[PDB]
């Protein structure tokens, strides 16, 4: 469908009080003006997408093939390049900011790389139960759980593919859907998004149109303090 996408960097989390008496936790995203580096058409390519360039950097910090591509396309040198599917209607070499893309309070989804956690066990990874601690116990307390499917020639006799055991956790792309934009800050180029965004502070963040609610925009307005100077 008509999917709109922007890229930014998560800077932290705060809260804002709103009319109708709710305290809304928000995530703050620093969104640089993104530059459309390429447009790929359905007829000529077999699919349609828009690839932008963001997180600008000086030319001496970029490799020779990438700077050659940037100077060939007459674009600002950036070290980050990525595309979003089904993004159409933007001319090559046009600066795009979230103000032109999304509305004041429309629903969007956000994709980001999760915070790395390393080699974690079965309980912390698959929400497994811990074995009993008292009334007599054994060496394996944080046991993963018996992986027996069948013992004997007439049964599996093997661990089934895709079993739930210990392994790497974190540093993986994850998407949280139906997040309402709260406010735009043009001067600081700063986007406010309700809820919590995955990833460490300072990581890359992709804001896209929500596929569950594409055109739904729920109104939200902030509260103006009525307090006055001390008497």
């Amino acid at each position: 469908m008509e999917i709109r996408g922007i890229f930014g960097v998560k800077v932290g989390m705060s809260q804002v009080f709103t009319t109708n008496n709710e305290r809304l936790p928000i995530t703050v995203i620093y969104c640089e003006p993104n530059q459309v580096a390429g447009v790929k058409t359905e007829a000529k390519d077999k699919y349609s997408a828009t690839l932008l360039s963001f997180d600008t950097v000086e030319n001496k910090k970029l490799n020779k093939p990438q700077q050659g591509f940037f100077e060939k396309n007459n674009l600002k040198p950036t070290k980050h390049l990525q595309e979003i599917r089904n993004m159409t209607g933007f001319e090559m070499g046009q600066q795009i900011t979230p103000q032109n893309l999304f509305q004041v309070g429309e629903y969007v989804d956000v994709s980001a790389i999760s915070k790395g956690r390393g080699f974690t066990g079965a309980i912390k990874r698959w929400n497994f139960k811990i074995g009993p601690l008292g009334h007599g116990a054994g060496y394996p307390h944080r046991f993963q759980g018996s992986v027996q499917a069948g013992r004997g020639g007439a049964s599996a006799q093997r661990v089934f593919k895709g079993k739930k055991m210990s392994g790497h956790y974190g540093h993986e792309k994850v998407t949280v859907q139906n997040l309402r934009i709260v406010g735009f800050d043009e001067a600081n180029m700063l986007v406010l998004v309700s809820g919590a965004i995955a990833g460490p502070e300072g990581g890359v963040v992709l804001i896209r149109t929500a596929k569950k609610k594409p055109g739904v925009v729920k109104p939200i307005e902030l509260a103006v303090q009525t307090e006055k100077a001390p008497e």
Partner: protein, 118 residues
């Protein structure tokens, strides 16, 4: 393109901070007027009591107020920079800590804080 994250968070918080934000220490008695909203109008409900803690930096500044009604002690956590909430410092008291937790263990004549502070 250097990003001072703390500064940007501060700007978002300043958008909705209050002007006065009266001060109070740990052991202080304040009057908190809750602007409860029904279908119509507002009923200003007072929650006068004793402060126990004031933590936070900006829009996330919170404080704890302890009250006692009919011998039942109730503790309530308010946000300072929250609309429809008005704080009025009544008595300034002397304490030797920032989180006076013993107030939720000591009661009666032993729950009275001497005045004065510096």
């Amino acid at each position: 393109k250097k990003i001072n994250k703390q500064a940007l968070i501060d700007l978002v918080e300043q958008k909705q901070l209050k002007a006065y934000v009266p001060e109070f220490s740990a052991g202080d008695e304040v009057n908190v007027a809750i602007k409860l909203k029904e279908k119509e109008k507002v009923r200003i409900q007072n929650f006068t009591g004793t402060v126990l803690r004031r933590r936070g930096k900006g829009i996330s500044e919170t404080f704890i107020v302890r009250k006692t009604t009919d011998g039942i002690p109730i503790e309530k956590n308010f946000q300072i920079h929250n609309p429809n909430i008005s704080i009025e410092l009544k008595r300034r008291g002397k304490v030797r800590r920032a989180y006076i937790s013993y107030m939720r263990e000591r009661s009666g004549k032993a729950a009275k804080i001497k005045e004065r502070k510096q």
